[PDB]
PDB file of all heavy atoms in Angstrom:
ATOM      1  N   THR L 106      48.837 -24.362  19.380  1.00  0.00           N
ATOM      2  CA  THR L 106      49.534 -23.804  20.535  1.00  0.00           C
ATOM      3  C   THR L 106      50.445 -22.729  19.995  1.00  0.00           C
ATOM      4  O   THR L 106      51.479 -22.980  19.306  1.00  0.00           O
ATOM      5  CB  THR L 106      50.232 -24.876  21.396  1.00  0.00           C
ATOM      6  OG1 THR L 106      51.034 -24.228  22.422  1.00  0.00           O
ATOM      7  CG2 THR L 106      51.098 -25.710  20.527  1.00  0.00           C
ATOM      8  N   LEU L 107      49.982 -21.512  20.178  1.00  0.00           N
ATOM      9  CA  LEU L 107      50.640 -20.356  19.581  1.00  0.00           C
ATOM     10  C   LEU L 107      50.654 -19.314  20.638  1.00  0.00           C
ATOM     11  O   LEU L 107      49.821 -19.344  21.565  1.00  0.00           O
ATOM     12  CB  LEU L 107      49.836 -19.824  18.385  1.00  0.00           C
ATOM     13  CG  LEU L 107      49.568 -20.684  17.153  1.00  0.00           C
ATOM     14  CD1 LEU L 107      48.679 -19.911  16.188  1.00  0.00           C
ATOM     15  CD2 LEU L 107      50.875 -21.170  16.437  1.00  0.00           C
ATOM     16  N   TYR L 108      51.592 -18.392  20.488  1.00  0.00           N
ATOM     17  CA  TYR L 108      51.624 -17.173  21.244  1.00  0.00           C
ATOM     18  C   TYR L 108      50.211 -16.550  21.333  1.00  0.00           C
ATOM     19  O   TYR L 108      49.464 -16.553  20.333  1.00  0.00           O
ATOM     20  CB  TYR L 108      52.631 -16.242  20.581  1.00  0.00           C
ATOM     21  CG  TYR L 108      52.693 -14.915  21.282  1.00  0.00           C
ATOM     22  CD1 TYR L 108      53.345 -14.774  22.519  1.00  0.00           C
ATOM     23  CD2 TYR L 108      52.088 -13.787  20.720  1.00  0.00           C
ATOM     24  CE1 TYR L 108      53.367 -13.513  23.176  1.00  0.00           C
ATOM     25  CE2 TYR L 108      52.113 -12.548  21.370  1.00  0.00           C
ATOM     26  CZ  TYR L 108      52.752 -12.417  22.589  1.00  0.00           C
ATOM     27  OH  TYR L 108      52.773 -11.178  23.189  1.00  0.00           O
ATOM     28  N   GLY L 109      49.845 -16.028  22.514  1.00  0.00           N
ATOM     29  CA  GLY L 109      48.444 -15.609  22.767  1.00  0.00           C
ATOM     30  C   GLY L 109      47.873 -14.620  21.767  1.00  0.00           C
ATOM     31  O   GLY L 109      46.745 -14.785  21.291  1.00  0.00           O
ATOM     32  N   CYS L 110      48.616 -13.561  21.450  1.00  0.00           N
ATOM     33  CA  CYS L 110      48.077 -12.537  20.517  1.00  0.00           C
ATOM     34  C   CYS L 110      48.020 -13.063  19.086  1.00  0.00           C
ATOM     35  O   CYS L 110      47.261 -12.571  18.256  1.00  0.00           O
ATOM     36  CB  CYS L 110      48.908 -11.239  20.581  1.00  0.00           C
ATOM     37  SG  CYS L 110      48.911 -10.528  22.234  1.00  0.00           S
ATOM     38  N   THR L 111      48.828 -14.074  18.778  1.00  0.00           N
ATOM     39  CA  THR L 111      48.689 -14.753  17.495  1.00  0.00           C
ATOM     40  C   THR L 111      47.363 -15.503  17.490  1.00  0.00           C
ATOM     41  O   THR L 111      46.598 -15.405  16.529  1.00  0.00           O
ATOM     42  CB  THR L 111      49.857 -15.687  17.200  1.00  0.00           C
ATOM     43  OG1 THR L 111      51.074 -14.946  17.262  1.00  0.00           O
ATOM     44  CG2 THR L 111      49.727 -16.334  15.774  1.00  0.00           C
ATOM     45  N   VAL L 112      47.039 -16.194  18.584  1.00  0.00           N
ATOM     46  CA  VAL L 112      45.693 -16.792  18.657  1.00  0.00           C
ATOM     47  C   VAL L 112      44.614 -15.683  18.457  1.00  0.00           C
ATOM     48  O   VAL L 112      43.644 -15.855  17.697  1.00  0.00           O
ATOM     49  CB  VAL L 112      45.470 -17.584  19.979  1.00  0.00           C
ATOM     50  CG1 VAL L 112      44.016 -18.138  20.083  1.00  0.00           C
ATOM     51  CG2 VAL L 112      46.503 -18.729  20.123  1.00  0.00           C
ATOM     52  N   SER L 113      44.803 -14.534  19.099  1.00  0.00           N
ATOM     53  CA  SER L 113      43.841 -13.426  18.967  1.00  0.00           C
ATOM     54  C   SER L 113      43.663 -12.943  17.507  1.00  0.00           C
ATOM     55  O   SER L 113      42.511 -12.750  17.035  1.00  0.00           O
ATOM     56  CB  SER L 113      44.260 -12.247  19.883  1.00  0.00           C
ATOM     57  OG  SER L 113      43.318 -11.170  19.848  1.00  0.00           O
ATOM     58  N   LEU L 114      44.789 -12.727  16.813  1.00  0.00           N
ATOM     59  CA  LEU L 114      44.799 -12.314  15.408  1.00  0.00           C
ATOM     60  C   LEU L 114      44.021 -13.290  14.523  1.00  0.00           C
ATOM     61  O   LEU L 114      43.157 -12.869  13.729  1.00  0.00           O
ATOM     62  CB  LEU L 114      46.265 -12.207  14.899  1.00  0.00           C
ATOM     63  CG  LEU L 114      46.485 -11.782  13.437  1.00  0.00           C
ATOM     64  CD1 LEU L 114      45.945 -10.363  13.149  1.00  0.00           C
ATOM     65  CD2 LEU L 114      47.983 -11.907  13.083  1.00  0.00           C
ATOM     66  N   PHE L 115      44.341 -14.583  14.670  1.00  0.00           N
ATOM     67  CA  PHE L 115      43.830 -15.635  13.816  1.00  0.00           C
ATOM     68  C   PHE L 115      42.379 -15.984  14.127  1.00  0.00           C
ATOM     69  O   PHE L 115      41.627 -16.353  13.226  1.00  0.00           O
ATOM     70  CB  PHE L 115      44.685 -16.905  13.941  1.00  0.00           C
ATOM     71  CG  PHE L 115      46.078 -16.809  13.315  1.00  0.00           C
ATOM     72  CD1 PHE L 115      46.973 -17.882  13.452  1.00  0.00           C
ATOM     73  CD2 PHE L 115      46.515 -15.660  12.633  1.00  0.00           C
ATOM     74  CE1 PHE L 115      48.262 -17.856  12.896  1.00  0.00           C
ATOM     75  CE2 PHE L 115      47.840 -15.605  12.082  1.00  0.00           C
ATOM     76  CZ  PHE L 115      48.708 -16.708  12.215  1.00  0.00           C
ATOM     77  N   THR L 116      41.980 -15.904  15.392  1.00  0.00           N
ATOM     78  CA  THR L 116      40.584 -16.255  15.739  1.00  0.00           C
ATOM     79  C   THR L 116      39.627 -15.062  15.745  1.00  0.00           C
ATOM     80  O   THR L 116      38.430 -15.216  15.447  1.00  0.00           O
ATOM     81  CB  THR L 116      40.460 -17.007  17.074  1.00  0.00           C
ATOM     82  OG1 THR L 116      40.956 -16.193  18.135  1.00  0.00           O
ATOM     83  CG2 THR L 116      41.230 -18.345  17.016  1.00  0.00           C
ATOM     84  N   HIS L 117      40.133 -13.870  16.040  1.00  0.00           N
ATOM     85  CA  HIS L 117      39.232 -12.696  16.030  1.00  0.00           C
ATOM     86  C   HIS L 117      39.241 -11.926  14.687  1.00  0.00           C
ATOM     87  O   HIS L 117      38.183 -11.694  14.089  1.00  0.00           O
ATOM     88  CB  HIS L 117      39.477 -11.741  17.219  1.00  0.00           C
ATOM     89  CG  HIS L 117      38.452 -10.649  17.305  1.00  0.00           C
ATOM     90  ND1 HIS L 117      37.157 -10.888  17.702  1.00  0.00           N
ATOM     91  CD2 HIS L 117      38.509  -9.334  16.976  1.00  0.00           C
ATOM     92  CE1 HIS L 117      36.464  -9.758  17.654  1.00  0.00           C
ATOM     93  NE2 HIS L 117      37.260  -8.800  17.207  1.00  0.00           N
ATOM     94  N   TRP L 118      40.430 -11.536  14.212  1.00  0.00           N
ATOM     95  CA  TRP L 118      40.496 -10.665  13.029  1.00  0.00           C
ATOM     96  C   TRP L 118      40.407 -11.388  11.676  1.00  0.00           C
ATOM     97  O   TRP L 118      39.603 -10.990  10.834  1.00  0.00           O
ATOM     98  CB  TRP L 118      41.691  -9.681  13.096  1.00  0.00           C
ATOM     99  CG  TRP L 118      41.666  -8.837  14.336  1.00  0.00           C
ATOM    100  CD1 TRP L 118      42.464  -8.986  15.449  1.00  0.00           C
ATOM    101  CD2 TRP L 118      40.774  -7.747  14.625  1.00  0.00           C
ATOM    102  NE1 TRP L 118      42.142  -8.034  16.391  1.00  0.00           N
ATOM    103  CE2 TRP L 118      41.106  -7.270  15.921  1.00  0.00           C
ATOM    104  CE3 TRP L 118      39.737  -7.117  13.909  1.00  0.00           C
ATOM    105  CZ2 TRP L 118      40.433  -6.196  16.524  1.00  0.00           C
ATOM    106  CZ3 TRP L 118      39.060  -6.047  14.503  1.00  0.00           C
ATOM    107  CH2 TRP L 118      39.418  -5.598  15.805  1.00  0.00           C
ATOM    108  N   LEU L 119      41.190 -12.438  11.455  1.00  0.00           N
ATOM    109  CA  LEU L 119      41.106 -13.140  10.155  1.00  0.00           C
ATOM    110  C   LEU L 119      39.679 -13.551   9.707  1.00  0.00           C
ATOM    111  O   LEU L 119      39.311 -13.305   8.561  1.00  0.00           O
ATOM    112  CB  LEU L 119      42.079 -14.329  10.043  1.00  0.00           C
ATOM    113  CG  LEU L 119      43.608 -14.156  10.189  1.00  0.00           C
ATOM    114  CD1 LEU L 119      44.415 -15.143   9.330  1.00  0.00           C
ATOM    115  CD2 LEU L 119      44.146 -12.746  10.100  1.00  0.00           C
ATOM    116  N   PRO L 120      38.870 -14.161  10.601  1.00  0.00           N
ATOM    117  CA  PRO L 120      37.510 -14.508  10.169  1.00  0.00           C
ATOM    118  C   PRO L 120      36.676 -13.284   9.782  1.00  0.00           C
ATOM    119  O   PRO L 120      35.838 -13.378   8.890  1.00  0.00           O
ATOM    120  CB  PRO L 120      36.915 -15.218  11.395  1.00  0.00           C
ATOM    121  CG  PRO L 120      38.136 -15.808  12.061  1.00  0.00           C
ATOM    122  CD  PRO L 120      39.182 -14.739  11.919  1.00  0.00           C
ATOM    123  N   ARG L 121      36.922 -12.138  10.416  1.00  0.00           N
ATOM    124  CA  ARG L 121      36.191 -10.917  10.055  1.00  0.00           C
ATOM    125  C   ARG L 121      36.491 -10.508   8.619  1.00  0.00           C
ATOM    126  O   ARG L 121      35.701  -9.829   7.996  1.00  0.00           O
ATOM    127  CB  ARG L 121      36.510  -9.775  11.032  1.00  0.00           C
ATOM    128  CG  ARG L 121      35.857  -9.965  12.387  1.00  0.00           C
ATOM    129  CD  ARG L 121      36.363  -8.967  13.410  1.00  0.00           C
ATOM    130  NE  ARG L 121      35.956  -7.602  13.105  1.00  0.00           N
ATOM    131  CZ  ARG L 121      34.805  -7.058  13.488  1.00  0.00           C
ATOM    132  NH1 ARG L 121      33.914  -7.768  14.184  1.00  0.00           N
ATOM    133  NH2 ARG L 121      34.526  -5.807  13.148  1.00  0.00           N
ATOM    134  N   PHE L 122      37.635 -10.948   8.097  1.00  0.00           N
ATOM    135  CA  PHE L 122      38.040 -10.627   6.728  1.00  0.00           C
ATOM    136  C   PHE L 122      37.751 -11.776   5.744  1.00  0.00           C
ATOM    137  O   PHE L 122      38.296 -11.804   4.637  1.00  0.00           O
ATOM    138  CB  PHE L 122      39.518 -10.217   6.689  1.00  0.00           C
ATOM    139  CG  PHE L 122      39.873  -9.073   7.646  1.00  0.00           C
ATOM    140  CD1 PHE L 122      41.092  -9.080   8.342  1.00  0.00           C
ATOM    141  CD2 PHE L 122      38.976  -8.018   7.884  1.00  0.00           C
ATOM    142  CE1 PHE L 122      41.417  -8.048   9.226  1.00  0.00           C
ATOM    143  CE2 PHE L 122      39.305  -6.989   8.776  1.00  0.00           C
ATOM    144  CZ  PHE L 122      40.535  -7.011   9.439  1.00  0.00           C
ATOM    145  N   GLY L 123      36.892 -12.713   6.148  1.00  0.00           N
ATOM    146  CA  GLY L 123      36.405 -13.756   5.234  1.00  0.00           C
ATOM    147  C   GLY L 123      37.426 -14.854   5.015  1.00  0.00           C
ATOM    148  O   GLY L 123      37.269 -15.704   4.119  1.00  0.00           O
ATOM    149  N   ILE L 124      38.461 -14.849   5.855  1.00  0.00           N
ATOM    150  CA  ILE L 124      39.492 -15.897   5.828  1.00  0.00           C
ATOM    151  C   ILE L 124      39.109 -17.009   6.801  1.00  0.00           C
ATOM    152  O   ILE L 124      38.764 -16.731   7.942  1.00  0.00           O
ATOM    153  CB  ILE L 124      40.876 -15.320   6.199  1.00  0.00           C
ATOM    154  CG1 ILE L 124      41.244 -14.178   5.220  1.00  0.00           C
ATOM    155  CG2 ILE L 124      41.990 -16.420   6.163  1.00  0.00           C
ATOM    156  CD1 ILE L 124      42.372 -13.264   5.726  1.00  0.00           C
ATOM    157  N   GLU L 125      39.153 -18.253   6.324  1.00  0.00           N
ATOM    158  CA  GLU L 125      38.810 -19.439   7.094  1.00  0.00           C
ATOM    159  C   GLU L 125      40.069 -19.931   7.813  1.00  0.00           C
ATOM    160  O   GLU L 125      41.146 -19.993   7.220  1.00  0.00           O
ATOM    161  CB  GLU L 125      38.283 -20.546   6.149  1.00  0.00           C
ATOM    162  CG  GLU L 125      37.063 -20.119   5.298  1.00  0.00           C
ATOM    163  CD  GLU L 125      36.669 -21.157   4.216  1.00  0.00           C
ATOM    164  OE1 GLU L 125      37.375 -22.158   3.993  1.00  0.00           O
ATOM    165  OE2 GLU L 125      35.655 -20.946   3.544  1.00  0.00           O
ATOM    166  N   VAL L 126      39.932 -20.262   9.097  1.00  0.00           N
ATOM    167  CA  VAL L 126      41.065 -20.613   9.918  1.00  0.00           C
ATOM    168  C   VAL L 126      40.739 -21.899  10.688  1.00  0.00           C
ATOM    169  O   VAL L 126      39.681 -21.999  11.341  1.00  0.00           O
ATOM    170  CB  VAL L 126      41.400 -19.472  10.917  1.00  0.00           C
ATOM    171  CG1 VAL L 126      42.572 -19.873  11.810  1.00  0.00           C
ATOM    172  CG2 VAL L 126      41.711 -18.159  10.172  1.00  0.00           C
ATOM    173  N   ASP L 127      41.626 -22.882  10.611  1.00  0.00           N
ATOM    174  CA  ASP L 127      41.587 -23.985  11.566  1.00  0.00           C
ATOM    175  C   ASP L 127      42.868 -24.041  12.404  1.00  0.00           C
ATOM    176  O   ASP L 127      43.983 -24.006  11.864  1.00  0.00           O
ATOM    177  CB  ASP L 127      41.363 -25.313  10.851  1.00  0.00           C
ATOM    178  CG  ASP L 127      39.955 -25.437  10.299  1.00  0.00           C
ATOM    179  OD1 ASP L 127      38.979 -25.413  11.083  1.00  0.00           O
ATOM    180  OD2 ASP L 127      39.811 -25.540   9.077  1.00  0.00           O
ATOM    181  N   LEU L 128      42.720 -24.123  13.720  1.00  0.00           N
ATOM    182  CA  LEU L 128      43.879 -24.395  14.594  1.00  0.00           C
ATOM    183  C   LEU L 128      43.987 -25.889  14.823  1.00  0.00           C
ATOM    184  O   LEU L 128      43.022 -26.517  15.271  1.00  0.00           O
ATOM    185  CB  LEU L 128      43.723 -23.672  15.929  1.00  0.00           C
ATOM    186  CG  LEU L 128      43.311 -22.202  15.783  1.00  0.00           C
ATOM    187  CD1 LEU L 128      43.044 -21.617  17.172  1.00  0.00           C
ATOM    188  CD2 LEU L 128      44.328 -21.353  15.028  1.00  0.00           C
ATOM    189  N   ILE L 129      45.146 -26.454  14.513  1.00  0.00           N
ATOM    190  CA  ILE L 129      45.304 -27.899  14.345  1.00  0.00           C
ATOM    191  C   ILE L 129      46.523 -28.349  15.139  1.00  0.00           C
ATOM    192  O   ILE L 129      47.467 -27.588  15.301  1.00  0.00           O
ATOM    193  CB  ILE L 129      45.519 -28.269  12.817  1.00  0.00           C
ATOM    194  CG1 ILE L 129      44.257 -27.985  12.002  1.00  0.00           C
ATOM    195  CG2 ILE L 129      45.886 -29.716  12.599  1.00  0.00           C
ATOM    196  CD1 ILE L 129      43.021 -28.705  12.485  1.00  0.00           C
TER     197      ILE L 129
END
């Protein structure tokens, strides 16, 4: 539960850069 654009950054852009992300 994060600010919306933080969700956007972490779910859209980070994976494009080969970074693995789990929202927990």
Side-chain angles (χ1 to χ4, degrees):
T106 173
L107 299 177
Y108 178 75
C110 300
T111 304
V112 177
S113 183
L114 180 62
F115 289 176
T116 61
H117 187 72
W118 304 105
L119 301 212
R121 287 170 67 87
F122 306 142
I124 302 163
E125 303 172 353
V126 178
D127 289 298
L128 313 174
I129 293 303

